Swiss-Prot record, chain A:
The chain holds residues 443 to 589 of 785 of the full protein. Binds to ribosomes as a homodimer. Binds to stalled/collided disomes, association is greater in (ribosome-targeted) antibiotic-treated cells (with increased stalling at specific mRNA sites). The clamp domain of one monomer binds the A-site finger, the 23S rRNA of the central protuberance and ribosomal protein uL5 of the leading (stalled) ribosome, while the other monomer binds in a gap between the ribosomal central protuberance and the L1 stalk of the leading ribosome. This is Putative endonuclease MutS2. Belongs to the DNA mismatch repair MutS family. MutS2 subfamily. Residues 71-144 form a coiled coil. Disruption phenotype: Not essential, it can be deleted. No change in spontaneous mutation rate; does not genetically interact with mutS or mutL. About 10-fold increased sensitivity to mitomycin C (MMC). Decreased transformation efficiency of both chromosomal (5-fold decrease) and plasmid DNA; a double mutS2-recU deletion strain has a 57-fold decrease in chromosomal DNA transformation efficicency. Hypersensitive to antibiotics that target the ribosome; erythromycin, chloramphencicol and tetracycline, but not to beta-lactam antibiotics. It is found in: Cytoplasm. The KOW and Smr domain are required for mitomycin C resistance. The ATPase and clamp domain (approximately residues 1-586) form a tweezer that holds the lead (stalled) ribosome. The long coiled-coil domain binds along the disome interface, coordinated by interactions with helix 39 of the 16S rRNA of both ribosomes. Deletion of the Smr domain (residues 702-785), which might have nuclease activity, has litle impact on ribosome rescue in vitro, but the strain is less competitive against wild-type in vivo. The gene is mutSB. It comes from the Bacteria. The ssrA gene (for tmRNA) encodes the SsrA tag added to nascent proteins in stalled ribosomes by trans-translation, which targets the nascent protein for degradation. Induction: Constitutively transcribed in rich and minimal media, highest transcripts occur in stationary phase in minimal media. In rich medium protein is expressed at a constant level during all growth stages (at protein level). Probably part of the polX-mutS2-yshE operon.
Curated annotation (Swiss-Prot), chain E:
Residues 1-46 form a coiled coil. The ssrA gene (for tmRNA) encodes the SsrA tag added to nascent proteins in stalled ribosomes by trans-translation, which targets the nascent protein for degradation. Belongs to the DNA mismatch repair MutS family. MutS2 subfamily. The chain holds residues 541 to 589 of 785 of the full protein. Acts as a ribosome collision sensor splitting the ribosome into its 2 subunits. Detects stalled/collided disomes (pairs of ribosomes where the leading ribosome is stalled and a second ribosome has collided with it) which it binds and splits, by an ATP-hydrolysis driven conformational change. Does not seem to have endoribonuclease activity (in the context of ribosome stalling). Does not seem to be involved in mismatch repair or in the prevention of interspecific recombination during DNA transformation. Might be involved in homologous recombination. Putative endonuclease that may be involved in the suppression of homologous recombination and may therefore have a key role in the control of bacterial genetic diversity. The lineage of its organism: Bacteria, Bacillati, Bacillota, Bacilli, Bacillales. This is Putative endonuclease MutS2.
């Protein structure tokens, strides 16, 4: 049983070429410049050096030149991971909204069930009070007719 | 931290400057690190520092 | 297992977070010797025991262990016919007092739904050693009026 | 517990990290694959994992 | 997105059912009060006759 770690653009691809091997990564949030420490099984780790450098103030002409020293395959891989990761972020955010709506719907359903029980109980009580009052009045009228 | 310091160096360097750089672009993907390092060295080299 | 790997991963610091949660030194004696093993069955028994005890400590009461110390030197010195000090008798008395309070605690815990066999077995293993306890409480006290 | 060398730590937390800072992870090994390689720059707590 | 649309639809339907149940309550209370008042009045009239 092997768990290994790497930062090499060769081993970004290592496990997909192999039977019985998994490639993974641990997620980084560029927007906070902080690791989320979240293990993504099946998703390999993009490099973000230029995006971090830009967020730290490195000039766009230096980043543009450095990106021209890279191979065409490098620039595709980290962009595809960013598109996957953004699609996953969208799924997670839209799910968090969906969980909020589901909790509100479940609460509203419990409130409606409780109101239906209270309504039936109030109705039965008012019918019983009305039947008692009718029976007392008929009994009073029968007594007056007897008199 | 290196990148913040490098940005601060790039704002201030001139032909009358010494600049000392240890392992430019370390702590990231080696290809992006090497590409950053070459572009930073070219930027500084043009100042004749 | 490799002691250098246990050291480099701070596995003794993991054990220290458990040692701070012990009510007596006896659980610390079982924790200090704690290391990984490959036996399977005793591993499975141990993790089932802490799970069952986690259900006790999450749902039921806390098991008292106050006044509970180790009486190994006292029991060995009493066994070879060497007359003990009243401090050794005090440690044995606190041990039997803890035996009594643990018997009472499982006696209170046994009235709920679903009785577990391990804690019930540990309860019925504890025997009435209250004659020795009453003799120690009436014999090692420093006021002579009860000693008479 | 098993002798098949199989692991599935559901929402696993590093035992020495603070409970308010520790991120919980599903870690699984020794079933569909015997080797995991954790790829990417040295930021993510790869060592902590 | 499909589950969200179904949950939002169900939430709107439940909100509408709460409004309809409150309106039916008020009407059923008023109809029960009227039927009680008419039974009282019919019993009074039959006594008067």
């Amino acid at each position: 049983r092997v768990l290994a770690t790497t930062h090499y653009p060769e081993l970004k691809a290592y496990g997909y070429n192999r039977e019985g091997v998994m490639n993974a990564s641990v997620e980084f949030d560029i927007e906070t410049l902080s690791p989320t420490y979240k293990l993504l099984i099946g998703v390999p780790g993009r490099s973000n050096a230029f995006e971090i450098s830009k967020r730290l103030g490195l000039p766009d002409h230096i980043i543009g030149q450095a990106k021209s020293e890279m191979t065409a395959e490098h620039n595709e891989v980290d962009t595809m991971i960013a598109s996957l990761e953004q699609s996953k972020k969208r799924a997670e955010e839209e799910l968090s909204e969906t969980e909020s709506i589901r909790k509100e719907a479940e609460k509203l359903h419990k409130e409606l069930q409780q109101q239906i029980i209270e309504l039936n109980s109030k109705k039965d009580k008012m019918l019983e009070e009305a039947e008692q009052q009718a029976a007392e009045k008929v009994k009073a009228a029968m007594k007056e007719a007897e008199d | 931290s290196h990148m913040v310091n490098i940005v601060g160096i790039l704002e201030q360097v001139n032909e009358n400057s010494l600049v000392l750089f240890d392992e430019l672009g370390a702590g990231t993907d080696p290809q992006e690190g090497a590409a950053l390092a070459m572009s930073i060295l070219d930027d500084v080299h043009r100042t004749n520092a | 297992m490799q002691q250098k790997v246990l050291s480099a991963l701070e596995f003794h610091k993991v054990k220290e977070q458990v040692i701070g949660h012990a009510a007596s030194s006896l659980g610390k004696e079982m924790l200090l010797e704690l290391k990984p093993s490959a036996s399977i069955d005793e591993i499975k028994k141990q993790l089932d025991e802490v799970d069952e005890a986690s259900d006790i400590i999450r749902l039921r009461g806390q098991a008292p262990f106050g006044g509970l110390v180790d009486i190994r030197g006292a029991l060995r010195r009493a066994e070879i016919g060497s007359v003990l000090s009243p401090s050794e008798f005090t440690e044995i008395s606190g041990l039997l007092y803890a035996v009594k309070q643990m018997k009472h605690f499982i006696t209170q815990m046994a009235e709920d739904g679903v009785d577990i066999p391990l804690i019930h077995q540990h309860a019925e293993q504890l025997i009435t050693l209250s004659d020795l306890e009453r003799d120690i409480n009436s014999c090692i006290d420093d006021h002579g009026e009860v000693l008479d | 517990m098993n002798d098949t060398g199989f692991i599935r730590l559901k929402k696993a937390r590093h035992p020495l990290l603070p409970p308010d800072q520790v991120v919980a992870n599903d870690i699984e090994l020794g079933r569909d694959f015997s080797t995991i390689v954790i790829t990417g720059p040295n930021t993510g707590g790869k060592t902590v994992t």
